[PDB]
Subunit: 48 residues, 2 copies
């Protein structure tokens, strides 16, 4: 049994490294959509 | 040796779930911003 518990822990850890892979593939979208509105919501009121 | 590792899974599962609860809000803020940028590209073009 201890083996099963350890296996579950390993699987949960696998989910977390991947959860680093999610959180950095998403934070790039945070910065990219930040610079787009910093381009657009600057230029929209100017073209207003 | 089994006993302390059983608690370590309880530690690591919620730390996974905390990022997994941070996973859905991080999509949610992008889903909050997925719509307006595709909207303002029309609005900037309609005013232009």
């Amino acid at each position: 049994a201890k083996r099963k518990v350890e296996g579950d822990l390993k699987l949960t850890q696998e989910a977390v490294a991947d959860l680093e892979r999610n959180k950095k593939e998403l934070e790039q979208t945070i910065q990219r959509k930040d610079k787009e509105i910093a381009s657009l919501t600057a230029k929209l009121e100017d073209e207003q």
